[PDB]
Amino acid sequence: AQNPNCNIMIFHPTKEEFNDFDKYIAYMESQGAHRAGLAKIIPPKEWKARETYDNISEILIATPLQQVASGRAGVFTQYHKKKKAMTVGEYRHLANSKKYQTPPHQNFEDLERKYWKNRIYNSPIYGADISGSLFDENTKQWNLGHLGTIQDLLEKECGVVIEGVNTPYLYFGMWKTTFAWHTEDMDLYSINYLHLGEPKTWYVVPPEHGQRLERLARELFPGSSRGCGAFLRHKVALISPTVLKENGIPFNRITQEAGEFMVTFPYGYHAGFNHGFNCAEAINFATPRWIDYGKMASQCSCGEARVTFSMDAFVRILQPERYDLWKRGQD
Template identity: 35%
Template sequence: MELKTVWSGGIPTFYPTMDQFKDFAKFIESVDKYGMETGIIKVVPPKEWVDSQPPLDETVKSIKIKNPIMQDVNGTGGLYKLHNIEKQRTYNIASWRQVCEEAENQPPAKRGQARKVTKKAKRSKINDDGDQFSGFDYRFDAQEFTPERCEELERIYWKSLTYSSPMYGADMPGSLFEDDCKVWNVAHLDNILNNLRVNIPGVNTAYLYCGMWKSTFAWHLEDMDLYSINYIHFGAPKYWYSISQQDRHKFYNLMKEMWPQEHSRCKEFLRHKTFHASPALLAQHGIKVNRTIHYQNEFMITFPYGYHSGFNFGYNVAESVNFATEAWLPFGRESKKCRCISDSVGIDVDQLIRWMKGDDALPLTPPHSNDEKDSEQGSEQEPRAKRRKVASRPRKQKQQQQQQQQKQQQQQPVFSSTQYPQCQLCPNPGDWDMVKSRTGKYAHRQCARLIPETSLSSQDRLVGLENVPKARTVLRCLQCGLTKGACVQCSEPKCVRAYHATCVETAGMLQIPLPGPRDHFEFLCRFHRPKRPPPQVVEKDLHSISWAYSLLPGEIVQGQLDGSDIFAGRVVENRLSEGMVLLQLAGSDDTIELEWKWLRSPHCLNINDAHIQRLIKSSAHAVKTKSHVAQSRKLPSPDSNPVQLSFKPVDPVNSTVDGDWVVEALGYDPQVLEYCEPLKYMYYLPQKSSLVTARYLAEP
């Protein structure tokens, strides 16, 4: 198929004839090689197809923009993080356009011209829609958005990205195409996802998107690395960016370096659609960004492994959906799914292939994910009731029941929550992100990162499990009280407190990341970690406030109020306008509102490099036992004059003290003891000590 093609900004634009255009599957097959190089392509449909589309005067009245998101953008220097906050209001398309044309929601006017001024949209009841649509015309004249004008607005967009919070009516189920439209109907595309036995919104059923000036979709890949198509029915254009597939690894590694904490929590963090980077920043690191302008009545198509992002120039309505061809099947098998977002999509490719072949029989084994690629895929089956034998039951009735049961099982979704295996490094339930070793054993990603002997390979596999010493596996976690798995210990020389990697947050332990080629940490328990800075200091610390501002729902954080122990909780909501978070406390269903200043920020630690170096020198990742600590504290010689010292024990369960060892000299002026030197003045009493409290004696 020879297509008229125009290249601009590194992206091809195709101008097919009606004969070339009418067969969607064949057209995608013919342009696939281009899309798999540039990430995205643009398709301008033939004029006769555009003219065949009916007017939407009545159809647009059904659009209800419920709870649009307000996009707060935080960042600087070309690196940004988006925070989507639902606005508790519903708009129809008439009131949405009125909001888009308010002065603060319009792009800057051309030099020498003034912005159009409109009155702010008033809240209206549903039965007032008739008045709002009186004289309303959904059509939009986009002639002013010439390529030169769009380039000017692109520069303004990046300069003012953080200055206002646009709204975006995103991910709204629906379609503006008529059912009798058989050619390139976004809601009814000819593709293999039609074989799915369940509707997945946005994947095989269409979504509508209502944009305004500066509303943004950040860098991301499609779920399951599927294809996607986007059509603007009417309105202002969109500006699209893409990364060529040959640069995708370079781009991912750069974003991983820019967002190390987010990457450590979720390897698929770029599927969150919240991390953004400017083309200028990417160019500084040798990554070419392709770009194009997407006008109304045009299609954009994204391809597997094609990172893309963009923004809207103003009021518009677009329609989008995912699709797949047979060429996608190998990509689907290898695709990895984000496990930290509840609505992340997974597809059982093997089951889909069976359905494509018309095989309605159930697989011999329950559907499951593709090895280590995605343990969350598979068919979820409801628990069966325990059967009782009935002697008089006819055989025919039994067969009918089995067929009915089989039919119900086949109709179960092919995306589901995971049945997690048991972690080898802790006893906690497997509702965290899991990784797998080559020997088929699993561990939480958190455990693999924090246990010193284990790590993650470049293929995201668990390695080093066999290197965990037995001494580490017999340590008792002071948080859950169990010895199963392996624990990390406080890095203070004399402290033997130990916790599972999934217990460190709730135990109030501080994790200190160290530089190096792999994840490497030192730890301080809540009795040896630095004291919390005063709230006034935290409020003035820009790094801490920026960190708090960027918290997303689902993240685990630590907090501490005046006179209380350190506690942990999961972020339910980050209320940016109020400077506080809503936390669900660990181990309970209780939620509390906590101001940012009471969070234990990882950027405001009151700890210096000398302290860290002392911890590294003292711990060296060796497992400390009571006997080891006692051995290091014996008197050097009988001739030395020991200083009598008393240790003030601290109860880690009931006490609220947040400090260090308390040392007191008896009988004469106190002496300054250097912590970098090992203490040699006390005898350890193992019979009178416990896991929590250590007892000492000045004389043997």
């Protein structure tokens, strides 16, 4: 069995190996990368996502989200308060302001300490989930707006044509902006490219141990757990590395820098935070190996998780017994 300790693997594909996306994901898996839940891919030196980032300031962040925490430093939830629209240029200025900028620090480890110690006492503003792409149309390799669609994958594997589309999303971050513990919709893969700016730290639980995390979360968020049998689908709960270590939950951590891709694997729980102003792009995708995960994925039917149009067909086809209850939660 490859990678039996479930360590995060880092890959350095050549320009020739960067041509065929599906084949390279399958290569990574042949080496055990999926066991960690997360892998890093450093593009060949010849590659670029686009020529420059000099002309992105007029992108609109229609609904910036202020991330307000409740709880204790290591065990907290966050809610998202909607703020007035602002441009990327306005957001970048805000991120760099004295109120929101990254504090002085020695290294990534010192910053991580300061995050966990102090996150709850601040409410950073995240420009998340913005439909769009920063890849140049002429970038042919690992262009997240030109991947094979999940609908086409389901059709190729299962023979059923379905409605729906699959497009990327932009995330503009600042110091302490936070992504809560989650897996993807329908336990899909995700791919994330950090276009520019400051790093993003990730934490991940191996897929084979995801239920250990779920059991801890039910213990630590007992009201939430009574409200919904899949409440981590709400994407609101944070648990620190210290707490995870105290409770014996297996996990790993890694920092992504500008110019690097991360891939999350089916049923790989992940969480993290941004170090300062940055812009990432991400999209879900599928492979043949995903289908069995999609068939087994938990679902939120309490009404909170509320998701895209395109998840309908996945539930309808892969989880017909669950469909009626899940759709009630959508409506």
